[PDB]
Amino acid sequence: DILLTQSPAILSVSPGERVSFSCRASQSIGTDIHWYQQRTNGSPRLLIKYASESISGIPSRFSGSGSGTDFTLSINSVESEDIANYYCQQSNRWPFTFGSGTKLEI
Amino acid sequence: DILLTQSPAILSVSPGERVSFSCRASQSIGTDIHWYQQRTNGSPRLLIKYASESISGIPSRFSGSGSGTDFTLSINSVESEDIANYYCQQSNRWPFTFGSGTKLEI
Amino acid sequence: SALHWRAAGAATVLLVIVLLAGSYLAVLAERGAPGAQLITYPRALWWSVETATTVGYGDLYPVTLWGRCVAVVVMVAGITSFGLVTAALATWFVGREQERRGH
Amino acid sequence: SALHWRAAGAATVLLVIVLLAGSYLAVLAERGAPGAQLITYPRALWWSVETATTVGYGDLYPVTLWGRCVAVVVMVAGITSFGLVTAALATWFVGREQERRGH
Amino acid sequence: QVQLQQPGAELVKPGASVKLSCKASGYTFTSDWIHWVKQRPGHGLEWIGEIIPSYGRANYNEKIQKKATLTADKSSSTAFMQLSSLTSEDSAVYYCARERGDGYFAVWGAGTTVTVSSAKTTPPSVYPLAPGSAAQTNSMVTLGCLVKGYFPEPVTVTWNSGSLSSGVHTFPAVLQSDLYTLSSSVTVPSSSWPSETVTCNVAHPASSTKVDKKIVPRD
Ligand SMILES: CCCCCCCCCO
Ligand SMILES: CCCCCCCCCO
Ligand SMILES: [K+]
Ligand SMILES: [K+]
Ligand SMILES: [K+]
Ligand SMILES: [K+]
């Protein structure tokens, strides 16, 4: 099964600064990676699909890039509401798997 | 996306000596590698295409080799005019990417 | 409309049905098998087409028994359908040549 | 010239047109998709040929929706064109055999 | 002839936008793609995006914040890159390059230096640098020209309209009080000067100015 590594587990940034979350797959998965945001006591919410596709309703601030084994979720100018845990998930091979998550700290 | 690693960043050679620049791709890219020379305050100039193909106008002194993930740009008998920054670039997969460059010092 | 043209049309419609059904069934058969890649519908439809045309790039393919049985149905349906179009074209040329000969 | 020979010739010319157009369009459809390899014209033409003949080595192939639609057009054009040549050959043999029988 | 022509410089106030141009000549094919590459001072080459003039479609580097919008005018064979809402992070040399659809950049433009600053444009003052009366000359003599108080970068300095290239050193500019200053050095056989004239030509793209200064021995 595909292992998704998210490191560092915690990312500290200053307000308005650009931030990048990392996701590395144990094997090549093309662009079959999706990102979710989960705030304290909230349910996961889809942010980006297929590595870089925008989801309607999500601030333009969010963007994704990468293909193969290395992926990145970026936030241009972070703000308080972005404080949460971020998870990547792959759908290239069965079974779907989740990364261990990265917390954004401001 | 394909990462192109050029190490060392600086190469020191004596006049008339043969020199070899290194370019390693994060994954196999066949022979889809191209080399450019950029002198101080100048624009990039194509030296070698598809890993080893000569470009008309470029001194015979320049040659390239390699395939897969490891490539080399060689200069037989370096001379002052060769002082510049050298970059590799791949076109095997989208998007095209550039190596970080190696400076030749005599 | 002559038989060969009607049969050709019918074969096309049946092929499209097999491609859609094959795509649905391939995902059903492959999910649950560790390592399988033919597990989402959009690429499964693409897979069904490149299988029916017998191109078979190798970018996607079934690893389970049932997925492979589905693949065989897709293959046979594609070969038979394109073969029937060829047969219809031959019949058309044969008919035209007979005429050109006064028959 | 009889119909089947003219149709065969026409099919060949049309196939060459589809290969060139398919090569151009495949690059247009694939650049912009991270990881795609069908992105330069020379190899895209090679890809179009091995697709139209249904060989499909797997060295190159489309990953996007539009690139895949282009591929399907190339596949169908190739199969139909070679199928039409077969149909023309059959018509030729049929005509010759009728003669050999005195008809 | 120059295949890709780009303007020398563009000064942009923070937050404003600018539209860079790239005029192409030479053979043109339906398979040509025009690329744009960004290079910050002292750093490497960064791919920005590409556009195919024959169709008008453009693709962009996903790894970086999108600052550019690419367009192309077929009738004038010109490609454009609109950079919007710029900050000092956007200050750099922006090259355009042509690819024949086969993966490599056959040719590059000279590049456009974009400076994002609130400061105002200022043409340079060109002063002569001739030896003092007590300087002993060898078989060679060194002359030069001082170019100060200009903004923004860059300036191009040539000697005798370019006919004099050997023995020439142009030093990197230094920034002080919102103004740049640099000098250029030229060495010729001591016997040829002043008999044979030596003049430096200073071009400042940003101000659309180009001045000449003949170097003659001191009074
Ligand atoms: C054509 C083969 C039958 C359809 C696939 C059935 C899959 C059942 C679950 O494994
Ligand atoms: C045959 C499918 C249409 C041609 C390809 C169009 C690509 C548009 C850009 O994505
Ligand atoms: K095949
Ligand atoms: K394969
Ligand atoms: K393989
Ligand atoms: K086949």
XYZ file of C-alpha atoms and ligand atoms in Angstrom:
661
model
C 0.000 0.000 0.000
C 1.132 3.567 -0.651
C 2.713 5.363 2.280
C 2.219 9.148 2.371
C 4.839 11.028 4.410
C 4.021 14.526 5.658
C 7.048 16.232 7.224
C 7.431 18.431 9.205
C 4.460 17.574 11.431
C 4.221 21.206 12.539
C 4.877 24.323 10.501
C 5.321 27.751 12.119
C 4.825 30.858 10.003
C 4.311 34.579 10.589
C 1.081 36.320 9.497
C 0.774 37.091 5.788
C 3.705 34.816 4.958
C 3.569 32.112 2.243
C 3.663 28.542 3.553
C 4.222 25.142 1.919
C 3.144 21.737 3.215
C 4.992 18.671 1.973
C 3.642 15.269 0.940
C 5.869 12.475 -0.365
C 4.527 9.181 -1.737
C 6.454 5.905 -1.330
C 6.023 5.321 -5.080
C 4.938 7.374 -8.088
C 1.225 8.211 -8.054
C 1.007 10.666 -10.966
C -1.212 13.555 -9.813
C -3.659 11.428 -7.819
C -3.208 13.386 -4.601
C -5.914 15.387 -2.769
C -5.631 17.807 0.185
C -7.977 18.295 3.138
C -8.196 20.885 5.898
C -9.455 19.969 9.358
C -9.964 22.645 11.991
C -10.166 21.872 15.707
C -13.346 19.863 16.332
C -14.359 20.101 12.685
C -14.732 17.574 9.901
C -12.219 17.331 7.006
C -12.792 19.667 4.067
C -11.518 19.208 0.506
C -9.125 22.007 -0.547
C -7.379 20.805 -3.702
C -7.989 17.779 -5.924
C -5.671 15.941 -8.329
C -2.622 17.784 -6.997
C -3.482 21.235 -8.324
C -7.181 21.570 -9.179
C -9.159 24.316 -7.460
C -12.368 23.596 -5.584
C -15.161 26.183 -5.773
C -15.637 27.915 -2.435
C -11.978 27.666 -1.426
C -9.986 30.941 -1.212
C -7.653 31.622 -4.155
C -4.963 31.742 -1.475
C -4.777 27.919 -1.664
C -2.877 26.158 -4.460
C -1.181 22.829 -5.082
C 1.650 21.516 -7.235
C 3.723 18.433 -7.952
C 3.442 15.040 -9.623
C 5.095 11.658 -9.179
C 6.212 11.209 -5.572
C 6.518 14.789 -4.303
C 3.625 17.157 -3.717
C 3.105 20.565 -2.180
C 0.117 22.449 -0.795
C 0.760 26.205 -0.636
C -1.012 29.100 1.063
C -0.192 32.631 -0.098
C -0.296 35.014 2.863
C -1.484 32.895 5.784
C -4.175 34.210 8.117
C -5.690 33.018 11.399
C -8.521 31.057 9.770
C -5.910 28.814 8.136
C -4.902 27.432 11.528
C -5.725 23.729 11.301
C -4.383 20.266 10.441
C -3.730 19.461 6.776
C -3.867 15.973 5.278
C -2.975 14.554 1.859
C -4.702 11.458 0.420
C -3.920 9.308 -2.604
C -6.230 7.524 -4.985
C -3.743 6.109 -7.510
C -3.780 2.561 -6.061
C -6.087 0.557 -3.812
C -6.507 1.085 -0.963
C -6.786 4.864 -0.686
C -4.430 6.062 2.071
C -3.923 9.232 4.124
C -0.795 11.095 5.135
C -0.234 11.584 8.874
C -1.014 15.315 8.789
C 0.725 18.657 9.302
C -0.463 21.342 11.740
C -0.181 25.013 10.775
C 0.946 27.294 13.594
C 1.052 31.089 13.350
C 8.110 17.621 -11.372
C 11.654 16.615 -12.300
C 14.392 17.929 -10.044
C 17.766 18.554 -11.719
C 20.738 18.523 -9.327
C 23.969 20.218 -10.402
C 26.817 19.554 -7.959
C 29.365 20.946 -7.270
C 28.059 24.508 -7.633
C 31.570 25.730 -8.443
C 34.276 23.950 -10.396
C 37.914 25.105 -10.342
C 40.229 24.012 -13.139
C 43.634 25.021 -14.496
C 44.013 26.391 -18.051
C 43.909 23.821 -20.849
C 42.566 21.151 -18.498
C 39.485 19.009 -19.286
C 36.456 19.722 -17.098
C 33.160 17.908 -16.478
C 29.909 19.378 -15.171
C 27.408 17.047 -13.537
C 23.621 16.925 -13.866
C 21.480 14.319 -12.108
C 17.731 13.941 -12.681
C 15.380 12.799 -9.892
C 13.971 10.193 -12.303
C 14.948 8.738 -15.675
C 14.554 11.220 -18.534
C 16.197 9.302 -21.394
C 18.400 11.794 -23.276
C 16.037 14.761 -22.953
C 18.623 17.034 -21.361
C 19.978 20.302 -22.833
C 22.889 22.513 -21.692
C 23.172 26.306 -21.663
C 26.043 28.705 -21.052
C 25.466 32.091 -19.441
C 28.301 34.587 -19.140
C 28.241 37.492 -16.691
C 25.490 39.901 -17.769
C 24.681 37.802 -20.822
C 21.675 35.771 -21.882
C 21.684 31.931 -21.848
C 23.098 30.214 -24.926
C 22.385 26.656 -26.085
C 25.537 24.481 -26.107
C 24.361 20.879 -26.414
C 20.927 19.398 -27.107
C 19.489 15.956 -26.319
C 22.425 15.109 -24.055
C 25.098 14.872 -26.741
C 24.070 16.639 -29.958
C 26.325 19.396 -31.269
C 25.004 22.854 -32.064
C 26.482 24.679 -35.065
C 28.588 27.630 -33.959
C 29.714 26.012 -30.706
C 33.427 25.088 -30.393
C 34.227 21.385 -30.853
C 35.712 21.686 -27.370
C 32.186 21.185 -25.956
C 30.611 17.721 -25.730
C 27.938 15.944 -23.719
C 27.198 12.394 -22.612
C 24.855 10.315 -20.489
C 21.291 9.017 -20.477
C 18.763 8.074 -17.815
C 19.401 10.063 -14.637
C 23.068 11.051 -14.952
C 24.463 13.517 -17.461
C 27.760 15.232 -18.118
C 28.830 18.336 -20.020
C 32.551 18.274 -20.852
C 35.007 20.891 -22.088
C 38.318 19.698 -23.536
C 41.073 22.163 -22.644
C 39.298 25.019 -20.877
C 40.118 28.615 -21.775
C 39.169 32.015 -20.351
C 36.135 32.489 -22.605
C 34.564 29.417 -20.987
C 34.260 31.255 -17.677
C 30.517 31.386 -17.029
C 27.562 29.648 -15.363
C 26.309 26.392 -16.890
C 22.736 25.126 -16.635
C 21.038 21.863 -17.619
C 17.336 21.696 -18.573
C 15.000 18.760 -19.119
C 12.148 18.335 -21.544
C 11.133 14.720 -20.868
C 8.110 15.623 -18.694
C 5.955 18.701 -18.160
C 6.866 21.170 -16.877
C 10.339 21.796 -18.285
C 12.735 22.439 -15.380
C 16.237 23.866 -14.918
C 19.155 22.725 -12.806
C 20.514 25.233 -10.276
C 23.713 25.905 -12.237
C 27.467 25.376 -11.940
C 30.056 28.164 -12.235
C 33.366 27.476 -13.985
C 36.388 29.030 -12.291
C 39.897 29.012 -13.760
C -31.026 0.562 -45.288
C -29.129 -2.614 -46.222
C -28.275 -5.199 -43.546
C -24.522 -4.540 -43.344
C -25.055 -0.847 -42.619
C -27.695 -1.557 -39.977
C -25.519 -4.235 -38.397
C -22.579 -1.808 -38.384
C -24.645 0.838 -36.637
C -25.968 -1.663 -34.127
C -22.465 -2.955 -33.422
C -21.329 0.598 -32.648
C -24.163 1.164 -30.185
C -23.537 -2.191 -28.553
C -19.820 -1.402 -28.275
C -20.552 1.887 -26.500
C -22.771 -0.046 -24.098
C -20.027 -2.590 -23.434
C -17.485 0.197 -22.842
C -19.708 1.889 -20.237
C -20.703 -1.368 -18.548
C -17.115 -2.613 -18.697
C -15.884 0.591 -17.070
C -18.403 0.264 -14.229
C -17.699 -3.442 -13.721
C -13.908 -3.083 -13.901
C -13.910 -0.667 -10.966
C -16.273 -3.007 -9.083
C -13.952 -5.955 -9.711
C -10.642 -4.185 -9.021
C -11.263 -2.176 -5.826
C -10.392 -4.466 -2.937
C -7.233 -5.729 -4.657
C -4.056 -4.215 -3.133
C -2.018 -2.455 -5.801
C -4.813 -2.212 -8.403
C -4.964 0.990 -10.491
C -8.167 0.493 -12.536
C -10.235 1.901 -9.670
C -11.874 5.208 -10.691
C -14.459 5.535 -13.477
C -12.943 8.204 -15.740
C -9.673 6.333 -16.321
C -11.570 3.030 -16.410
C -13.521 4.299 -19.436
C -10.227 5.306 -21.092
C -8.889 1.840 -20.276
C -11.970 0.211 -21.837
C -11.459 2.155 -25.065
C -7.732 1.401 -25.443
C -8.584 -2.242 -24.702
C -11.439 -2.472 -27.231
C -9.217 -0.974 -29.952
C -6.503 -3.479 -28.884
C -3.937 -0.678 -28.387
C -3.091 -1.661 -24.797
C -0.511 0.931 -23.731
C 0.006 -0.718 -20.366
C -0.761 2.418 -18.350
C -3.770 0.637 -16.850
C -4.909 -2.984 -16.655
C -6.841 -5.463 -14.456
C -5.098 -7.638 -11.903
C -8.113 -9.607 -10.600
C -9.942 -12.584 -12.062
C -13.251 -10.770 -12.586
C -11.553 -7.637 -13.884
C -9.742 -9.788 -16.417
C -12.957 -11.527 -17.449
C -14.489 -8.075 -17.984
C -11.433 -7.152 -20.064
C -11.892 -10.206 -22.288
C -15.499 -9.205 -22.985
C -14.349 -5.682 -23.882
C -11.620 -7.045 -26.173
C -13.932 -9.432 -28.023
C -16.655 -6.807 -28.368
C -14.190 -4.311 -29.820
C -12.563 -6.741 -32.247
C -15.937 -8.080 -33.379
C -17.397 -4.587 -33.839
C -14.522 -3.183 -35.891
C -14.391 -6.460 -37.802
C -18.044 -6.100 -38.678
C -17.418 -2.588 -40.020
C -14.681 -4.010 -42.252
C -17.090 -6.688 -43.463
C -19.701 -4.034 -44.236
C -17.164 -1.990 -46.211
C -16.174 -5.075 -48.207
C -19.829 -5.781 -49.014
C -20.218 -2.187 -50.215
C -17.192 -2.437 -52.525
C -18.342 -5.835 -53.808
C -21.765 -4.440 -54.645
C -20.280 -1.418 -56.409
C -17.815 -3.487 -58.439
C -20.578 -5.828 -59.630
C -22.426 -2.767 -60.923
C -19.337 -1.357 -62.622
C -19.232 -4.701 -64.448
C -22.849 -4.424 -65.534
C -24.173 -7.049 -63.117
C -10.015 3.345 -61.188
C -12.542 1.210 -59.288
C -14.150 2.529 -56.088
C -12.309 0.294 -53.604
C -8.910 1.418 -54.878
C -9.892 5.090 -54.806
C -11.380 4.716 -51.335
C -8.193 2.973 -50.180
C -6.052 5.801 -51.499
C -8.305 8.409 -49.940
C -8.256 6.596 -46.601
C -4.448 6.669 -46.637
C -4.342 10.410 -47.279
C -6.941 11.036 -44.601
C -4.975 8.890 -42.143
C -1.809 10.916 -42.755
C -3.841 14.058 -42.092
C -5.203 12.627 -38.846
C -1.694 11.604 -37.739
C -0.322 15.126 -38.283
C -3.332 16.852 -36.729
C -3.379 14.338 -33.880
C 0.301 14.976 -33.192
C -0.248 18.744 -33.054
C -3.366 18.445 -30.892
C -1.866 15.876 -28.508
C 0.947 18.256 -27.573
C -1.608 21.071 -27.184
C -3.731 18.908 -24.885
C -0.904 17.398 -22.811
C 1.386 20.353 -21.995
C 0.097 21.841 -18.759
C -0.407 18.411 -17.174
C 2.302 17.605 -14.582
C 4.063 14.368 -15.471
C 2.897 14.217 -19.112
C 5.415 12.928 -21.687
C 3.540 13.417 -24.994
C 4.748 17.021 -25.165
C 7.099 17.511 -28.147
C 6.041 17.089 -31.787
C 8.560 14.554 -33.120
C 7.747 11.880 -30.529
C 4.062 12.836 -30.687
C 4.033 11.879 -34.383
C 5.691 8.551 -33.497
C 3.057 8.089 -30.793
C 0.264 8.797 -33.299
C 1.602 6.136 -35.662
C 2.011 3.388 -33.036
C -1.497 4.276 -31.831
C -3.107 4.190 -35.295
C -1.541 0.777 -35.993
C -2.798 -0.324 -32.532
C 0.712 -1.434 -31.472
C 0.767 0.684 -28.297
C 4.198 -0.015 -26.798
C 3.486 2.103 -23.746
C 6.545 4.326 -24.177
C 4.230 7.303 -24.677
C 0.545 7.963 -24.017
C -1.941 10.730 -23.082
C -2.911 11.406 -19.492
C -5.441 14.225 -20.050
C -9.069 14.114 -21.133
C -8.536 15.972 -24.417
C -5.343 14.081 -25.194
C -7.257 10.850 -24.723
C -10.092 12.040 -26.954
C -7.477 12.840 -29.613
C -6.056 9.339 -29.125
C -9.469 7.757 -29.704
C -9.819 9.625 -33.003
C -6.359 8.418 -34.055
C -7.204 4.827 -33.085
C -10.512 4.770 -34.961
C -9.007 6.433 -38.025
C -6.191 3.890 -38.134
C -8.402 0.842 -37.621
C -10.935 2.084 -40.171
C -8.245 2.897 -42.750
C -6.429 -0.436 -42.545
C -9.801 -2.176 -42.439
C -10.795 -0.454 -45.647
C -7.597 -1.660 -47.334
C -8.484 -5.216 -46.301
C -11.969 -4.743 -47.740
C -10.484 -3.475 -51.002
C -8.166 -6.490 -51.219
C -11.103 -8.838 -50.641
C -13.075 -7.129 -53.416
C -10.095 -7.567 -55.749
C -9.817 -11.296 -54.994
C -13.586 -11.737 -55.340
C -13.539 -10.069 -58.744
C -10.606 -12.183 -59.919
C -12.139 -15.450 -58.711
C -15.421 -14.711 -60.507
C -13.416 -14.306 -63.712
C -11.458 -17.509 -63.144
C -14.884 -19.172 -62.978
C -15.985 -17.637 -66.260
C -18.371 -15.108 -64.714
C 19.336 39.142 -37.182
C 18.078 39.316 -33.571
C 15.364 36.654 -33.355
C 13.759 37.964 -30.126
C 13.650 41.674 -29.218
C 12.845 42.760 -25.653
C 12.885 46.285 -24.120
C 15.825 46.963 -21.808
C 14.012 47.910 -18.612
C 10.759 48.654 -16.817
C 10.291 50.547 -13.549
C 7.144 49.588 -11.643
C 5.783 51.000 -8.388
C 4.808 48.362 -5.795
C 1.287 47.114 -6.421
C 1.151 48.258 -10.039
C 1.390 46.011 -13.090
C 3.434 46.005 -16.290
C 3.208 44.331 -19.692
C 6.475 43.024 -21.132
C 6.895 42.451 -24.864
C 8.902 40.088 -27.047
C 9.066 40.780 -30.789
C 10.143 37.749 -32.823
C 11.642 37.555 -36.314
C 13.212 34.813 -38.426
C 11.387 31.596 -39.326
C 8.042 31.082 -37.590
C 6.190 27.766 -37.400
C 2.793 26.709 -36.090
C 4.715 24.522 -33.653
C 6.644 27.369 -31.992
C 6.213 28.012 -28.279
C 7.369 31.221 -26.592
C 8.665 30.769 -23.047
C 9.338 33.255 -20.259
C 12.042 32.762 -17.652
C 12.716 34.789 -14.516
C 16.172 35.309 -13.014
C 16.823 37.265 -9.829
C 20.289 38.803 -9.358
C 22.895 36.238 -8.369
C 20.340 33.434 -8.715
C 19.341 30.748 -11.210
C 16.799 30.434 -14.021
C 13.134 29.961 -13.122
C 10.563 28.881 -15.709
C 7.427 31.066 -15.620
C 5.209 29.796 -18.419
C 4.763 29.221 -22.136
C 2.351 30.086 -24.918
C 1.742 28.712 -28.393
C 1.010 31.664 -30.719
C -0.642 29.526 -33.422
C -3.379 28.488 -30.985
C -3.117 31.038 -28.176
C -3.042 28.605 -25.245
C -0.780 29.305 -22.274
C 0.522 27.117 -19.430
C 2.106 28.246 -16.153
C 4.555 26.993 -13.526
C 2.311 25.569 -10.778
C 5.042 25.740 -8.123
C 4.997 29.537 -7.937
C 2.409 32.224 -7.224
C 0.918 33.243 -10.572
C 1.992 36.800 -11.399
C 1.905 36.480 -15.184
C -0.688 36.301 -17.952
C 0.609 35.461 -21.424
C -0.858 36.583 -24.742
C 0.390 36.765 -28.326
C -0.346 38.865 -31.397
C 0.129 36.859 -34.598
C 0.019 39.817 -37.000
C 2.862 41.624 -35.220
C 4.637 38.405 -34.227
C 4.789 39.692 -30.673
C 4.322 37.818 -27.414
C 3.364 39.615 -24.207
C 3.633 38.881 -20.489
C 1.413 40.893 -18.173
C 2.835 40.954 -14.636
C 0.367 42.331 -12.080
C 0.444 43.561 -8.474
C 4.222 43.447 -8.187
C 6.433 43.660 -5.100
C 10.229 43.829 -4.724
C 10.178 40.020 -4.890
C 9.214 40.461 -8.538
C 12.295 42.549 -9.354
C 14.439 40.534 -11.775
C 15.481 39.996 -15.365
C 12.700 38.409 -17.420
C 13.761 36.547 -20.559
C 11.603 35.357 -23.401
C 12.820 32.331 -25.364
C 11.730 30.397 -28.419
C 11.269 26.627 -28.572
C 10.442 24.856 -31.837
C 8.205 22.363 -30.022
C 11.135 20.013 -29.600
C 12.101 20.717 -25.992
C 15.045 23.121 -26.049
C 15.351 26.891 -26.103
C 17.018 27.511 -29.448
C 17.285 31.239 -28.769
C 16.793 33.764 -25.962
C 15.958 37.450 -25.837
C 18.394 39.880 -24.195
C 16.036 40.132 -21.236
C 14.068 42.931 -19.599
C 15.226 44.199 -16.214
C 12.171 44.918 -14.094
C 12.617 46.978 -10.936
C 9.763 47.304 -8.451
C 10.353 50.509 -6.477
C 8.663 53.781 -5.511
C 11.771 55.787 -6.417
C 11.774 57.918 -9.565
C 13.692 57.414 -12.802
C 16.952 59.337 -13.138
C 19.376 59.467 -16.081
C 23.083 58.967 -15.219
C 25.742 61.693 -15.234
C 28.772 60.608 -17.255
C 32.176 61.962 -16.219
C 35.610 61.352 -17.843
C 38.488 59.546 -16.131
C 41.832 60.696 -17.560
C 45.253 60.255 -15.886
C 46.648 63.001 -13.697
C 49.542 65.087 -14.986
C 52.045 63.241 -12.773
C 50.999 59.735 -13.813
C 53.737 57.820 -15.637
C 52.440 55.907 -18.657
C 53.661 52.447 -19.654
C 53.272 50.776 -23.045
C 49.573 50.888 -22.179
C 47.310 53.562 -20.728
C 44.110 53.155 -18.724
C 41.145 55.491 -19.127
C 37.540 55.292 -18.008
C 34.211 56.923 -17.329
C 32.223 57.453 -14.158
C 28.473 56.844 -14.412
C 26.626 57.982 -11.287
C 23.252 59.026 -9.952
C 21.097 56.826 -12.171
C 18.025 54.722 -11.429
C 16.883 52.088 -11.948
C 19.341 49.544 -13.356
C 20.730 48.827 -15.863
C 23.024 50.921 -18.065
C 25.066 49.568 -20.972
C 28.546 50.988 -21.473
C 30.486 50.493 -24.708
C 33.685 52.043 -26.049
C 33.925 53.738 -29.445
C 30.387 52.639 -30.315
C 31.368 49.044 -29.636
C 34.403 48.896 -31.931
C 36.592 48.773 -28.816
C 35.958 45.648 -26.714
C 39.341 44.282 -25.656
C 40.770 45.814 -22.490
C 37.350 46.822 -21.150
C 36.033 46.276 -17.585
C 32.670 47.567 -16.418
C 32.257 47.296 -12.654
C 28.987 46.225 -10.971
C 26.921 49.214 -9.822
C 26.664 50.149 -6.134
C 23.410 51.393 -4.610
C 23.432 54.455 -2.351
C 20.554 56.813 -1.510
C 18.203 55.472 -4.201
C 20.846 55.974 -6.897
C 23.367 53.744 -8.667
C 26.966 54.426 -9.619
C 29.548 52.490 -11.614
C 32.695 53.053 -13.642
C 34.003 51.399 -16.772
C 37.672 50.831 -17.546
C 39.443 50.740 -20.911
C 43.107 50.144 -21.697
C 44.729 50.960 -25.047
C 48.345 51.258 -26.219
C 49.757 54.467 -24.739
C 50.852 55.635 -28.192
C 47.360 55.493 -29.720
C 45.834 57.982 -27.280
C 44.962 60.856 -27.677
C 45.944 60.535 -31.372
C 43.180 57.957 -31.803
C 39.933 58.974 -30.119
C 38.442 57.057 -27.182
C 34.803 57.649 -26.282
C 32.451 55.764 -23.966
C 28.777 55.388 -24.840
C 26.343 55.146 -21.941
C 22.804 53.939 -22.570
C 20.139 54.051 -19.879
C 17.065 52.107 -21.094
C 14.744 53.245 -18.292
C 15.145 56.919 -19.238
C 15.458 56.285 -22.979
C 18.781 58.124 -22.963
C 22.193 57.476 -24.479
C 25.102 59.882 -24.143
C 28.706 59.945 -25.316
C 31.757 61.256 -23.525
C 35.064 61.659 -25.317
C 38.071 61.034 -23.073
C 40.788 63.640 -23.595
C 43.957 64.357 -21.589
C 43.584 66.849 -18.736
C 44.321 70.537 -19.461
C -18.039 -10.171 -16.637
C -17.620 -10.599 -15.230
C -18.712 -10.332 -14.186
C -18.776 -8.861 -13.747
C -17.802 -8.521 -12.608
C -18.306 -9.040 -11.264
C -17.427 -8.605 -10.100
C -17.966 -9.178 -8.793
C -17.121 -8.781 -7.580
O -15.954 -9.172 -7.450
C -10.287 16.031 -30.469
C -10.278 16.802 -29.148
C -10.173 18.319 -29.355
C -8.743 18.785 -29.666
C -7.897 19.041 -28.409
C -8.277 20.356 -27.733
C -7.369 20.698 -26.562
C -7.817 22.004 -25.913
C -6.945 22.403 -24.721
O -6.913 21.721 -23.688
K -1.455 -3.716 -29.017
K 4.823 -0.945 -20.234
K 6.538 -0.183 -17.840
K -3.329 -4.548 -31.657
